[PDB]
User: What shape does this take?
Amino acid sequence: KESRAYLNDESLSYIRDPLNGQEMSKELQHLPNDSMRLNYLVNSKQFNVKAFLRDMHKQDSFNDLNNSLDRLDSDIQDQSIHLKQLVGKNFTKYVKIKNKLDQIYKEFDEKTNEKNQCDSPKENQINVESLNKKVDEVIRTTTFKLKPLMDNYQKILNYQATKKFIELNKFYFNLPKSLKRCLTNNDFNEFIIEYSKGLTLRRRFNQSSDASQSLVIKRIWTQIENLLVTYKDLIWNSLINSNFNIDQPQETILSLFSKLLNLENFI
Amino acid sequence: ETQQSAMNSSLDHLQNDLNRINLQWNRILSDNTNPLELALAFLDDTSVGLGHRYEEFNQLKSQIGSHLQDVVNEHSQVFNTNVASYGKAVSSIMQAQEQTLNLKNCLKEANEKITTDKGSLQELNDNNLKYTKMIDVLVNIEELLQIPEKIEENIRKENFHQVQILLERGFIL
Amino acid sequence: TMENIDDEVLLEILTDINWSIEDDADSMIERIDLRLAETEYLFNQNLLSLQKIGPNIRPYEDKVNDECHRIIPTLSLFLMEMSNFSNDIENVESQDNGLQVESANKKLLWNTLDELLKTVSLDEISLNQLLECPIREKNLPWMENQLNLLLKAFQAIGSDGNEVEYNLREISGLKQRLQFYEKVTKIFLNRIVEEMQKKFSNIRGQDISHDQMIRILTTLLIFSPLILFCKEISQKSYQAIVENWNVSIQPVYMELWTKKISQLQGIDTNDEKMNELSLSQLLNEWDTFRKERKTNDINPVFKNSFSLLTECLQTMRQECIVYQNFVEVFFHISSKHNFEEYIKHFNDPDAPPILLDTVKVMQSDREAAVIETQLVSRIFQPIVTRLSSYFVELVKAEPTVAPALTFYLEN
Amino acid sequence: MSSDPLQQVCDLIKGDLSLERVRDIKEQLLKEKSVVEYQLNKESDKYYGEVEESLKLLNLSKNSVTSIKQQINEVNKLGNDNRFAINRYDILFRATKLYETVNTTSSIYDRIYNFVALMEHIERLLVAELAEDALETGCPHLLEIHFLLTSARDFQEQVVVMAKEATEDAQRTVMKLFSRLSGIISKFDKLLDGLTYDIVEMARAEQISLAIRLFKIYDLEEREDLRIEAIRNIIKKKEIEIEKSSIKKLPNSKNTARLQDETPKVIEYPTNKGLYQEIMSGTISTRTAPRGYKHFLINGINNSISEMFGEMREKYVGDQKFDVLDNMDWIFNELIIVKEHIANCCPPHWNIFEVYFDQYYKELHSLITDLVESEPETIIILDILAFDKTFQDTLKQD
Assistant: This one.
């Protein structure tokens, strides 16, 4: 399918022409356009001025005005003589080296985007049609994944939340554990004392940094309010009626005030 | 680096500028065009006479050939630059491979590949007809455990058993 | 300090309550997860052949785009055929000898001498003279020239130094954009101090409910800093002057709306009178002239429907004037392109809202949303009379490219 | 539910109040949901990744292909840069003055239509060389393809007679038509006497290591060149159906035309609206169109020269009762030897490998008629054609 189909004739003709460019001045015995800047001589179907750049000696940090300029005048003089009749004086091939150089480019204003081509080859005018209509068709796909991708993010979000409460067992509990413990016995006192000791571990998860865990801040917040409730219960009891082991109740206000204003002391 | 280049222009190229510009009078006089079928009919073959059109034409061959001293190296430059329509449009045909073919068909087709054979259209029902069923397992595990325990061991602690009978009222509700 | 949670892990745990506590509620989260699993497999086979044929119903328009684009296959094989055969005529035309050192030697005489336009090396006259901090704000030499001189600092490919057979910026690239990005590192810290400074003036800018209009005219004084095409954030720094500088300066606007919007609380106590007006309605009706008018319904007076145009509008400050922080994201970083040329002229966005064709992400809408909904929570008369209120809230934002749809989904 | 009451029967297959067996029945439901979520898990994952590549390439080609046709906005709008600028010289006098004499092909048409008359009257014997082979013409890549290019120079009078359809004069295809009597059909049929005698010379038991090499080389050169040539003319009606039926059949004419379009929309008007999609410019440019039947339409006579020699070697009697596939399958062995010898000769055309299976139509159709009724030896009817079925399979690729 090279007649015509625009690709197999362009690959065969125009890409057999590419190796014809790769062996035009490179295989001219031997890389005569340069002074062996590349053995394979990339590319010689174009400049490739990082690969084949040795048309004369310098080629230096500032001496490209010295010898590469003298390469321009040197091979523009030797090619001013030899190219005056190589394709020069026989310039039907130079009338064709201006025909398929400028009039084919004049047809490339008609093979542009777009501009005043016909303009009824329909390419011309949406060159970003895959964005102009298929990001709009992909905006119908945004209506699709509006359901589905949001389902994926809330999906893995919920699974990650199961990981999150899976990553918090003594903490993110212990609101009802120490809360139910509170009114129960003393709270043991250990069910307040050791419970907010081993919870003061993870209350120092909520204190070795906090930003901005309003979850964990709410956790040790309710720990604080509950601890104040057993505080005012404790001195309310030992104050008003005052009937227990009095040294024990003063030990309760003592240790409970010690931890209570110890964390308020951290506040 | 200024890179001072000395081509053959403005002294060579003035012969292209002035002597190939004889076509304003020379090419309009002989009128050597429209079509190349003069002596295919074997009639005139001049016609007449393509000498002044060969003065402008040969002024493009020689007067723009001596102008092509270093310009037959340099007319000679958009062989790799007037193929900009050849580097892009076939790439647009490759894009027509990608967009007129692969974006639309990979879109709606490579979309529609994972289809029923989900399957889920069975199995998510079979998940559901398990799941809700397993729900009515555990709920009927609850209520059948409830009134046998609550009336038994919560004889004493009344108004804690009110919670239990409320939950039986829900579980059987 | 800011783990994989607090990215709406609050709003994740806002399924029912984090009110003591529960691992039971974690099981409840597993139940909602399976509910989403059947709703999303339900979306999957809903869209897998069915609305994948709905995507084939889209391929009417989209394969039609492949049909005008199939004329682009004919325009692409037409232009590629004219240039295929005409470029083959170029392959025989210029390469009559071919022998490109004898037939097309504009570049074989000049294998490096045709690429000899690299003389703008290197540094650093107009990098700090044409911009003191700036010299700009009149399409001036730091807008028009020293910006584009920093585009010459980026036109200089500072790691593509020599290729020593060419050797354009071998030692010129050692301090071209190191003095242009040293002096423009001083201009960069100048616009960073102008970002924390001018954005602290935007933190002082609290014009009219709320409105940060001083941050809008001040955002006109920041479009040149984000346009600034080198490029503009060379090391993610100009956007960090637009975002990481606005990190705390979101929370001045976010703290502003946070303390602001939650203060409109006022309600009734007991309305058996109005149920004697809708019991007095059906008494003298109908059978009479009605009675009701439509009568009260005292909730129709905007005790909470006021926020439906206010905290949906202040939510549209968390969203749609944060879509005027789509005039302040970088802005709208695009477009000036040399390096402040087009946005030297065109530095006036709307930005809100305005259409839907993009892909992006943003923030600064959490507490206004949770404030609007959690404020509206204990509302037991609504949403019976507020049916089309909360469903208009459901169907609020279709056509924008903002997260106001997710707000409307939160609504 | 309508499943749950049925599930209340399935768990009511445990008793009525059966809390231990209710627990175990719940473990059975856990097994069912367990495997249903294993397969629904991985199946849902494969579907999800299919959506991931689906939207990932709708993304990647929406953006990247929008920047591939918009990379054709970049490089093709870069095509519009030097439209009236390039080649740094008098290109206006190169395309209108030096290319004015490109519209002056008169004397080449007089000495080449006249030399196409006289020299192809000479090439009606010299490039139509035969009698007998002497390497098939001798040398039909010289001879029969000399009649192909002599018929490609007379494709100015064969194919570009269909391009020069009232171009500028009346005797360009009339006074040159008597110069095409000894010019076109003394070159095209000279390439078809050299082509039918080339493939017929390639149907000559060797045939040969230089006769079928040269002869088949002409019958692949002008065969595949004829195929891309008439494919360039059928793609001049398909590049005109792409082009002039985007102009005449825009639809904005909107009659369309009477009666040079529908029919012949789209051809549409030769020299050059109906010709330049197979003519200049046009770097081909005639299309060629040699030789039409070098083996472009004459590779069927090679595999049908072993499948007409093979079908001819039936001798339908069957000369004992079923010896049709003896000489016919012998011509199938000569079809494999001539086939692989000709693919060793000619890659593009002229019996690459189809002579084997064409001779399997000769042996297949031949053996399905020698014992069609009981007219052959009925006791030896199926053993013969079946013995050549499996044996002539095993004598080849089977």
User: Anything to note?
Assistant: Chain A has eleven helices and no strands.
